[PDB]
Design an enzyme around this catalytic site. Sequence first.
Site, PDB file in Angstrom:
ATOM      1  N   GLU A 131       2.664  -0.920  -0.779  1.00 20.27           N
ATOM      2  CA  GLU A 131       1.374  -1.160  -0.130  1.00 20.27           C
ATOM      3  C   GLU A 131       0.181  -1.318  -1.067  1.00 20.27           C
ATOM      4  O   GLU A 131      -0.865  -0.686  -0.894  1.00 20.27           O
ATOM      5  CB  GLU A 131       1.132  -0.035   0.884  1.00 20.27           C
ATOM      6  CG  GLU A 131       2.249   0.005   1.919  1.00 20.27           C
ATOM      7  CD  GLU A 131       2.151   1.142   2.917  1.00 20.27           C
ATOM      8  OE1 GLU A 131       1.155   1.893   2.898  1.00 20.27           O
ATOM      9  OE2 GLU A 131       3.091   1.284   3.729  1.00 20.27           O
ATOM     10  N   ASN A 172       6.796  -3.671  -2.280  1.00 24.01           N
ATOM     11  CA  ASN A 172       7.000  -3.553  -0.833  1.00 24.01           C
ATOM     12  C   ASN A 172       5.673  -3.507  -0.079  1.00 24.01           C
ATOM     13  O   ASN A 172       4.723  -2.888  -0.543  1.00 24.01           O
ATOM     14  CB  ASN A 172       7.790  -2.251  -0.609  1.00 24.01           C
ATOM     15  CG  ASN A 172       8.340  -2.098   0.796  1.00 24.01           C
ATOM     16  OD1 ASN A 172       9.051  -2.966   1.301  1.00 24.01           O
ATOM     17  ND2 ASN A 172       8.041  -0.962   1.422  1.00 24.01           N
ATOM     18  N   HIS A 209       7.172  -3.978  10.429  1.00 21.89           N
ATOM     19  CA  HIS A 209       6.873  -3.038  11.509  1.00 21.89           C
ATOM     20  C   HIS A 209       6.192  -3.940  12.537  1.00 21.89           C
ATOM     21  O   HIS A 209       4.995  -4.213  12.449  1.00 21.89           O
ATOM     22  CB  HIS A 209       5.908  -1.948  11.036  1.00 21.89           C
ATOM     23  CG  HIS A 209       6.525  -0.964  10.094  1.00 21.89           C
ATOM     24  ND1 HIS A 209       7.585  -0.161  10.452  1.00 21.89           N
ATOM     25  CD2 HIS A 209       6.240  -0.661   8.805  1.00 21.89           C
ATOM     26  CE1 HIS A 209       7.927   0.597   9.424  1.00 21.89           C
ATOM     27  NE2 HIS A 209       7.127   0.312   8.414  1.00 21.89           N
ATOM     28  N   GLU A 237      11.783  -1.947   6.367  1.00 13.30           N
ATOM     29  CA  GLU A 237      11.471  -0.838   7.272  1.00 13.30           C
ATOM     30  C   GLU A 237      11.329  -1.333   8.697  1.00 13.30           C
ATOM     31  O   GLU A 237      10.385  -0.995   9.410  1.00 13.30           O
ATOM     32  CB  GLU A 237      10.166  -0.168   6.833  1.00 13.30           C
ATOM     33  CG  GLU A 237      10.147   0.224   5.368  1.00 13.30           C
ATOM     34  CD  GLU A 237       8.874   0.931   4.958  1.00 13.30           C
ATOM     35  OE1 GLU A 237       8.104   1.361   5.845  1.00 13.30           O
ATOM     36  OE2 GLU A 237       8.652   1.071   3.738  1.00 13.30           O
ATOM     37  N   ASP A 239      11.302  -2.073  12.537  1.00 15.21           N
ATOM     38  CA  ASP A 239      11.239  -1.438  13.841  1.00 15.21           C
ATOM     39  C   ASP A 239      10.367  -2.363  14.681  1.00 15.21           C
ATOM     40  O   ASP A 239       9.525  -3.096  14.158  1.00 15.21           O
ATOM     41  CB  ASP A 239      10.778   0.049  13.847  1.00 15.21           C
ATOM     42  CG  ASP A 239       9.541   0.324  13.024  1.00 15.21           C
ATOM     43  OD1 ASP A 239       8.635  -0.522  12.986  1.00 15.21           O
ATOM     44  OD2 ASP A 239       9.469   1.427  12.432  1.00 15.21           O
TER      45      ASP A 239
END
Length: 302
Positions: A131, A172, A209, A237, A239
């Site tokens: 990030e 990432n 996400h 990651e 979802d």
Amino acid sequence: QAAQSVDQLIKARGKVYFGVATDQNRLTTGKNAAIIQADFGQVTPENSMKWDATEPSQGNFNFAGADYLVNWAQQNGKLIRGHTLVWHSQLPSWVSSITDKNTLTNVMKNHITTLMTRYKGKIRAWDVVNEAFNEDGSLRQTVFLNVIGEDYIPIAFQTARAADPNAKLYINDYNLDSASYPKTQAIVNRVKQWRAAGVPIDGIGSQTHLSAGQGAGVLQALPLLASAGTPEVAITELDVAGASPTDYVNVVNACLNVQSCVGITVWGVADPDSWRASTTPLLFDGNFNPKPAYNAIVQDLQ
């Protein structure tokens, strides 16, 4: 555990893995371990390898949780993605208190080197920097950027390569889900520039996400990320709020369509344990039963 393994099926399609985030607390409760053993082929520590867990006081490392996961993964034949070395969140106060460039640089290098050496050769990939970008594409002003300067990213990657040349090094980030979004374009441009300067960035990790309906955009965003020229890209990651089969299948297809996409990691096993539990965004429900989205992915991969 579902009879059909998405990891086995994605491997049959030519990819490396389909994994999940986990840690000791999940592995010792419910049906998590059973599901991971049967349906996934890779694990990412949800919290045990972060800075707050591993170096709560300078030079005083704690590897209990990390060791548990690495040993479990090794015994069960699962690949491991280390997560994460340099990040502004979950960062001990002693680090953010440092205002001297030489000091912070040495502290950062030591943190990276110590963690990576301990697991040398056992970690497939590491999220070295996490990030680092603002939504407008500029670099996030964290203690690392403020004290060390832009060079902190090249330094982190060069240090990581030296610590364990076996691991694939990733930068990432999230919100890299739309090709027209400024952040997506910026990371591609910066990574191109860094690699041209000799910085060892092996992959771009896209957290993914998502909110309902955003899966479609990934079909264009992922190939754009792959255009940066890194050896690999990965969905790290995943979802999806609502867990619609449509969104999940679109993300899987995006990876299948991109040659350099090595795999997908979903952020957790069962809904209740999700960091976004209220949106029931995962592939297994509260009773550890596979949801429609899981079956849709299986059908799409066969």
